Amino acid sequence: MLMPRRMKYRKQQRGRLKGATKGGDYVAFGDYGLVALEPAWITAQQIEAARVAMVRHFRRGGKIFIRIFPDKPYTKKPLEVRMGKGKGNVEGYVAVVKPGRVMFEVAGVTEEQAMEALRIAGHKLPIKTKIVRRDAYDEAQ
Amino acid sequence: GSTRNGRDSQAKRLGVKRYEGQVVRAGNILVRQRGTRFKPGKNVGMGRDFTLFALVDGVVEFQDRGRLGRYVHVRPL
Amino acid sequence: RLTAYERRKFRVRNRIKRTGRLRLSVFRSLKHIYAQIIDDEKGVTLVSASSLALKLKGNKTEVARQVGRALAEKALALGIKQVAFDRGPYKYHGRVKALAEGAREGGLEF
Amino acid sequence: MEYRLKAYYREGEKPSALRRAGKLPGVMYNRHLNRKVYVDLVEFDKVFRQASIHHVIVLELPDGQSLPTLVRQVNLDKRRRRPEHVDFFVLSDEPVEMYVPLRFVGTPAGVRAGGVLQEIHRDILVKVSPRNIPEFIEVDVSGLEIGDSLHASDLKLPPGVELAVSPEETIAAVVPPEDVEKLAEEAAAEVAEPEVIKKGKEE
Amino acid sequence: PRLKVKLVKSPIGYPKDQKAALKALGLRRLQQERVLEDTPAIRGNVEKVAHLVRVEVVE
RNA sequence: CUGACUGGGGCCUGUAGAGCACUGAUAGGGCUAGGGGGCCCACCAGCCUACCAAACCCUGUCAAACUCCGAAGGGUCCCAGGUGGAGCCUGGGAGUGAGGGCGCGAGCGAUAACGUCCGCGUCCGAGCGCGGGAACAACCGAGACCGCCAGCUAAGGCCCCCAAGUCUGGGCUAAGUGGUAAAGGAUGUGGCGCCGCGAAGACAGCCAGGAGGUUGGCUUAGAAGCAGCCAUCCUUUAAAGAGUGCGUAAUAGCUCACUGGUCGAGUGGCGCCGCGCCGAAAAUGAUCGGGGCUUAAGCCCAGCGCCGAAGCUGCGGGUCUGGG
RNA sequence: CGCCUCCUAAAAGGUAACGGAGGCGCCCAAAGGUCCCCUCAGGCGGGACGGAAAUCCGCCGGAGAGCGCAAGGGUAGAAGG
RNA sequence: CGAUCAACGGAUAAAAGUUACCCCGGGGAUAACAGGCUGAUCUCCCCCGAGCGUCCACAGCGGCGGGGAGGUUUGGCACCUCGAUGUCGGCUCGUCGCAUCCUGGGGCUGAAGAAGGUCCCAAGGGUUGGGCUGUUCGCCCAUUAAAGCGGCACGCGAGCUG
RNA sequence: UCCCCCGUGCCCAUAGCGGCGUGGAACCACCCGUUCCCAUUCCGAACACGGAAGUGAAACGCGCCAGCGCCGAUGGUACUGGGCGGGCGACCGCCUGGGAGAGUAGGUCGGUGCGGGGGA
Ligand SMILES: NC(=[NH2+])NCCC[C@H](N)C(=O)O
Ligand SMILES: [Mg+2]
Ligand SMILES: [Mg+2]
Ligand SMILES: [Mg+2]
Ligand SMILES: [Mg+2]
Ligand SMILES: [Mg+2]
Ligand SMILES: [Mg+2]
Ligand SMILES: [Mg+2]
Ligand SMILES: [Mg+2]
Ligand SMILES: [Mg+2]
Ligand SMILES: [Mg+2]
Ligand SMILES: [Mg+2]
Ligand SMILES: [Mg+2]
Ligand SMILES: [Mg+2]
Ligand SMILES: [Mg+2]
Ligand SMILES: [Mg+2]
Ligand SMILES: [Mg+2]
Ligand SMILES: [Mg+2]
Ligand SMILES: [Mg+2]
Ligand SMILES: [Mg+2]
Ligand SMILES: [Mg+2]
Ligand SMILES: [Mg+2]
Ligand SMILES: [Mg+2]
Ligand SMILES: [Mg+2]
Ligand SMILES: [Mg+2]
Ligand SMILES: [Mg+2]
Ligand SMILES: [Mg+2]
Ligand SMILES: [Mg+2]
Ligand SMILES: [Mg+2]
Ligand SMILES: [Mg+2]
Ligand SMILES: [Mg+2]
Ligand SMILES: [Mg+2]
Ligand SMILES: [Mg+2]
Ligand SMILES: [Mg+2]
Ligand SMILES: [Mg+2]
Ligand SMILES: [Mg+2]
Ligand SMILES: [Mg+2]
Ligand SMILES: [Mg+2]
Ligand SMILES: [Mg+2]
Ligand SMILES: [Mg+2]
Ligand SMILES: [Mg+2]
Ligand SMILES: [Mg+2]
Ligand SMILES: [Mg+2]
Ligand SMILES: [Mg+2]
Ligand SMILES: [Mg+2]
Ligand SMILES: [Mg+2]
Ligand SMILES: [Mg+2]
Ligand SMILES: [Mg+2]
Ligand SMILES: [Mg+2]
Ligand SMILES: [Mg+2]
Ligand SMILES: [Mg+2]
Ligand SMILES: [Mg+2]
Ligand SMILES: [Mg+2]
Ligand SMILES: [Mg+2]
Ligand SMILES: [Mg+2]
Ligand SMILES: [Mg+2]
Ligand SMILES: [Mg+2]
Ligand SMILES: [Mg+2]
Ligand SMILES: [Mg+2]
Ligand SMILES: [Mg+2]
Ligand SMILES: [Mg+2]
Ligand SMILES: [Mg+2]
Ligand SMILES: [Mg+2]
Ligand SMILES: [Mg+2]
Ligand SMILES: [Mg+2]
Ligand SMILES: [Mg+2]
Ligand SMILES: [Mg+2]
Ligand SMILES: [Mg+2]
Ligand SMILES: [Mg+2]
Ligand SMILES: [Mg+2]
Ligand SMILES: [Mg+2]
Ligand SMILES: [Mg+2]
Ligand SMILES: [Mg+2]
Ligand SMILES: [Mg+2]
Ligand SMILES: [Mg+2]
Ligand SMILES: [Mg+2]
Ligand SMILES: [Mg+2]
Ligand SMILES: [Mg+2]
Ligand SMILES: [Mg+2]
Ligand SMILES: [Mg+2]
Ligand SMILES: [Mg+2]
Ligand SMILES: [Mg+2]
Ligand SMILES: [Mg+2]
Ligand SMILES: [Mg+2]
Ligand SMILES: [Mg+2]
Ligand SMILES: [Mg+2]
Ligand SMILES: [Mg+2]
Ligand SMILES: [Mg+2]
Ligand SMILES: [Mg+2]
Ligand SMILES: [Mg+2]
Ligand SMILES: [Mg+2]
Ligand SMILES: [Mg+2]
Ligand SMILES: [Mg+2]
Ligand SMILES: [Mg+2]
Ligand SMILES: [Mg+2]
Ligand SMILES: [Mg+2]
Ligand SMILES: [Mg+2]
Ligand SMILES: [Mg+2]
Ligand SMILES: [Mg+2]
Ligand SMILES: [Mg+2]
Ligand SMILES: [Mg+2]
Ligand SMILES: [Mg+2]
Ligand SMILES: [Mg+2]
Ligand SMILES: [Mg+2]
Ligand SMILES: [Mg+2]
Ligand SMILES: [Mg+2]
Ligand SMILES: [Mg+2]
Ligand SMILES: [Mg+2]
Ligand SMILES: [Mg+2]
Ligand SMILES: [Mg+2]
Ligand SMILES: [Mg+2]
Ligand SMILES: [Mg+2]
Ligand SMILES: [Mg+2]
Ligand SMILES: [Mg+2]
Ligand SMILES: [Mg+2]
Ligand SMILES: [Mg+2]
Ligand SMILES: [Mg+2]
Ligand SMILES: [Mg+2]
């Protein structure tokens, strides 16, 4: 599943989740999109579960666009150790997601199909979501 | 479990020491820096560690000359 | 993209300007040779001399010398004594050297 | 075809106040003029959804004027996904750079074989006269297989309109579909753990 | 033109530079009023502690 | 008179935000070295790639140790305000060198801890003195010299316990929600918008009909609209998908969409906001502090009045400092 | 466990944790002073042996090379040759 | 000029262990018990509906993911207690919770009946004797309507055992 | 004080790349030579000297062109000093003062000082 092929640094500070998305807020490829209503660290496994849910629904046909990437290493100390002795080990990767982000887009599929696939995908994610359709507003971006 | 980090060096207290319009005496250090972030201008010398300092009594003046760099001048009083 | 000529010029001139003396610049064409004494602090020329202006004639070296002597005479008239030689892109040699020597014979200080 | 939208002049009114009153703040400009305006949000929305940045919107000003415009820019509220501002570009007799809708005529052979038509550009950037704005530009995609592509060079352009992007710019492509039969290989696909770029004496 | 400044809300809990502004204005007790000349330097301290203070323009 | 703080002016800065020009990351597409693979050759070349892909370009993004950009602020100097239990100089005497809570900014931790470690601020410490918060060092209010059976306020309050409104006007809630929780679920209720379909008679019900090629094919062992696909084409039509679901071992059958009739005015599906409902199990006896409260004594918007402290005022007194 | 560089570090300075990453305990008789001269990496095309890369030629190429060694700053109008 | 005085502001020119035979001064400034805060871990309950179940997503199940509750596990933290809060297990004596083992009442069933499965209501009462082992737990023997799980300082040593 | 050229500064790409055109009387350059001064890790390419037949081909100067590069508003937004609220939290808002970056409109094929030589 998704993770950087390589990196400059093994571990990242945690940082913050203030604000609406920096960018990525308009449908840019497909006909429909899944937009983030709440901030979260979205894991690579969450992203993949969402993906697989959509291709499983489509069976054959359609195209999925995954517009977020988990490049942020997630860290956890080995179980039952005390505080100190350095930063925990990298256990996984997450994509930072803030409200308004279009996480996924679909194309090549009917409206009924896209609505349903994106719904099922949403249930795999730790945040509230909204289904949207490409607009003149998107096109003008 | 342990760390192979934990090192850092002493802070070097670099930067401009006398800002534009300040009255300095000859020898007064004007800038501590690595390399020439500022270049010596009129009545300003430069030491082996890029330290800018006033060659005369006077008033400090800065000047940004684009691609030619930022300069520090001293204007005689 | 600068040229060897342009770099060489900047290099020797920058060094001169740091000392803050009046600057004796010398231009040497295939035919003529020119000198102006420059105040780089006001960005103004103080006194000038050339083979083209003096209608000098003969051997380029002997000419250079003469324009040097000439520049000196006019310079001393304005109270200009000490100066710094700006050979620019030219080697200190031949025509430029001659002009320099002619300037010195006139009592220009350098 | 051509749309009409009542606009109004604004001076010092706070954008927030206007927006809370259901008014969409905006600006209209060109090399000759620059004016702060506002339009009724829902009225604007009815228009823009049809007109987009493609079709001319003439603004009926309160001083009796009527200026032909193109929407140059719409600023979206990133959180709420809503327009918060409009740039109206006031047209004049000069040629103008603008976006013209691409209309994809035909069903790609690739699509019949199960593929998907990715419409990379849904409009194309073009210089043209305001008097000359076409409504669309057709493209024949029925020849495209999985995975073939069309470029802006393959665009057959109507009279008086000139491509304003590189002919190299790709405008459509026909891609392979999603397939569950691939899921299993992807799931049992092992990834090599990330390599960390060497610092220091190691490069 | 002058400013009548009344201290109406306590500086306890507020940053020390606001406490100092009050001292520059000569305001030391709650409900205390001072009539100060309207100069930018004074206006600057009055505005700094506006949330503590009640201002009126006088004469 | 130099102080904290403040006005103006100049200089210094690389954070917030943003961006992708550099260092790296990055999905897709295009283009295109390099391989994998397939045709075709050992005669050394050719052709095809829904294969993994470098560089490049496009669209779209990511970054404490990235920056083409870049604030608010912050720092410092000058002039001016600033007479303060301000400042500077010399010297005598210390104590302290276990801090803690809270707000904001980060790191560590698990977008844990009455956690831990720094930064800016604050309060407790030392204000466990006073009012509010049921009770409660650090939340809100406020810096207690003494006295008064006087007045005004703060936060918080004004149905009774309990001082002051069972105060006034508009709305919402029916859950005692108020008076502890989430994904998620729902013809709870209300307000806005958006659509359709309707007196070319809709929706609901009740009436019929709902059909041929055709048990259609990639197609396999049953596959007859209703076990996967890379299929949906037409015929007779008023109408009827090569089919909504129930159904069958497949069949058949029921039904939908569907068109006609019967009634005669609305009907169905979206979306945005307010308040509620479920989701909601833990150990001695319960409870919003209690009583008790429903056009509230709840929630939202707008008001007038009052109560309320050791704050402020009135009156009297002390002491120190300053001025007479 | 001292020292250097970057980040954490909240755009002056400073700032902690058994926080995130790397270095030093040398070296150079020139790798020092000065005067003079010179300008890179890389891409493309061309050239016996010669190759992805040896040396040569042309064009483009502001600095992405170089600067003994970590990192940062600086730097060709040289600190590089 | 002689310093890996590198524990790098460098105690001597010169230095390792052990104490369950231990001792004093102190600390709840700091660990082990219990409590507390937290809930990663643990236990339980949900959301999604891939797929299983001859046929049929939901009788019984529930891929990949998502949200919680509890405070019985193992921990994190170090907040009262180190001028003492006796720590496992048993016995005795109970009492409470309910996520119910049985008995009572229900819905669904892939419920013919009988017997089950699964969920809902329900804490009134009940929930055996024995072999092993310090055991808690667990395995086993013989039964049973059933042989429930947890809290009470892992309830209870000024009640006993040890 | 006007136009052209030659020097030399300043602003520091609105000045740059590319394309095209233009200039030799003057000036500048290439150029003609390598005796002499001086010079090449080889080379008169460079540096240097002595020249004056030729050419503005190269370079340079001066125009024009917006393909690139560079510059770039006004609006609106993010963010925020100070002041307030809300959420159990991740976080979300209001007031006042400040206010980007991206992008859009558009701008740009330089401007200017001093001294020379020439022209009117
Ligand atoms: N200086 C300011 N006004 N800052 C505004 C930020 C404050 C607050 N977080 C808000 O979003 O409104
Ligand atoms: Mg952190
Ligand atoms: Mg997580
Ligand atoms: Mg972590
Ligand atoms: Mg441990
Ligand atoms: Mg750690
Ligand atoms: Mg960790
Ligand atoms: Mg993970
Ligand atoms: Mg995001
Ligand atoms: Mg979700
Ligand atoms: Mg964009
Ligand atoms: Mg180590
Ligand atoms: Mg460290
Ligand atoms: Mg160290
Ligand atoms: Mg440090
Ligand atoms: Mg330091
Ligand atoms: Mg440092
Ligand atoms: Mg500085
Ligand atoms: Mg020196
Ligand atoms: Mg040096
Ligand atoms: Mg200045
Ligand atoms: Mg000066
Ligand atoms: Mg709208
Ligand atoms: Mg090294
Ligand atoms: Mg206060
Ligand atoms: Mg006070
Ligand atoms: Mg307060
Ligand atoms: Mg303040
Ligand atoms: Mg301050
Ligand atoms: Mg007071
Ligand atoms: Mg007031
Ligand atoms: Mg004073
Ligand atoms: Mg001062
Ligand atoms: Mg001061
Ligand atoms: Mg000030
Ligand atoms: Mg940021
Ligand atoms: Mg980048
Ligand atoms: Mg871009
Ligand atoms: Mg970030
Ligand atoms: Mg960023
Ligand atoms: Mg940083
Ligand atoms: Mg940054
Ligand atoms: Mg800028
Ligand atoms: Mg500033
Ligand atoms: Mg300041
Ligand atoms: Mg200032
Ligand atoms: Mg003063
Ligand atoms: Mg005094
Ligand atoms: Mg004092
Ligand atoms: Mg004092
Ligand atoms: Mg004393
Ligand atoms: Mg004493
Ligand atoms: Mg002490
Ligand atoms: Mg002491
Ligand atoms: Mg100590
Ligand atoms: Mg201490
Ligand atoms: Mg302590
Ligand atoms: Mg501390
Ligand atoms: Mg501490
Ligand atoms: Mg805090
Ligand atoms: Mg707050
Ligand atoms: Mg904080
Ligand atoms: Mg930090
Ligand atoms: Mg603490
Ligand atoms: Mg905390
Ligand atoms: Mg914390
Ligand atoms: Mg504190
Ligand atoms: Mg104490
Ligand atoms: Mg207090
Ligand atoms: Mg205090
Ligand atoms: Mg107290
Ligand atoms: Mg009390
Ligand atoms: Mg209290
Ligand atoms: Mg109280
Ligand atoms: Mg009370
Ligand atoms: Mg309290
Ligand atoms: Mg407390
Ligand atoms: Mg108190
Ligand atoms: Mg007092
Ligand atoms: Mg009153
Ligand atoms: Mg009040
Ligand atoms: Mg009350
Ligand atoms: Mg009463
Ligand atoms: Mg009231
Ligand atoms: Mg009433
Ligand atoms: Mg209820
Ligand atoms: Mg209640
Ligand atoms: Mg309740
Ligand atoms: Mg919900
Ligand atoms: Mg509902
Ligand atoms: Mg509702
Ligand atoms: Mg109905
Ligand atoms: Mg069939
Ligand atoms: Mg049938
Ligand atoms: Mg509930
Ligand atoms: Mg009412
Ligand atoms: Mg009172
Ligand atoms: Mg008092
Ligand atoms: Mg009195
Ligand atoms: Mg007194
Ligand atoms: Mg006194
Ligand atoms: Mg720092
Ligand atoms: Mg820093
Ligand atoms: Mg700093
Ligand atoms: Mg700072
Ligand atoms: Mg200092
Ligand atoms: Mg350590
Ligand atoms: Mg080391
Ligand atoms: Mg040498
Ligand atoms: Mg040498
Ligand atoms: Mg090369
Ligand atoms: Mg080659
Ligand atoms: Mg070869
Ligand atoms: Mg080669
Ligand atoms: Mg370099
Ligand atoms: Mg020794
Ligand atoms: Mg070591
Ligand atoms: Mg030591």
Ligand SMILES: [Mg+2]
């Ligand atoms: Mg030692």
Ligand SMILES: [Mg+2]
């Ligand atoms: Mg040492």
Ligand SMILES: [Mg+2]
């Ligand atoms: Mg030491």
Ligand SMILES: [Mg+2]
């Ligand atoms: Mg030290």
Ligand SMILES: [Mg+2]
């Ligand atoms: Mg010693």
Ligand SMILES: [Mg+2]
């Ligand atoms: Mg010793």
Ligand SMILES: [Mg+2]
């Ligand atoms: Mg000895």
Ligand SMILES: [Mg+2]
């Ligand atoms: Mg020893």
Ligand SMILES: [Mg+2]
């Ligand atoms: Mg020793």
Ligand SMILES: [Mg+2]
């Ligand atoms: Mg011993």
Ligand SMILES: [Mg+2]
């Ligand atoms: Mg022993």
Ligand SMILES: [Mg+2]
């Ligand atoms: Mg022993």
Ligand SMILES: [Mg+2]
């Ligand atoms: Mg023994």
Ligand SMILES: [Mg+2]
């Ligand atoms: Mg013994």
Ligand SMILES: [Mg+2]
């Ligand atoms: Mg003994």
Ligand SMILES: [Mg+2]
């Ligand atoms: Mg013994």
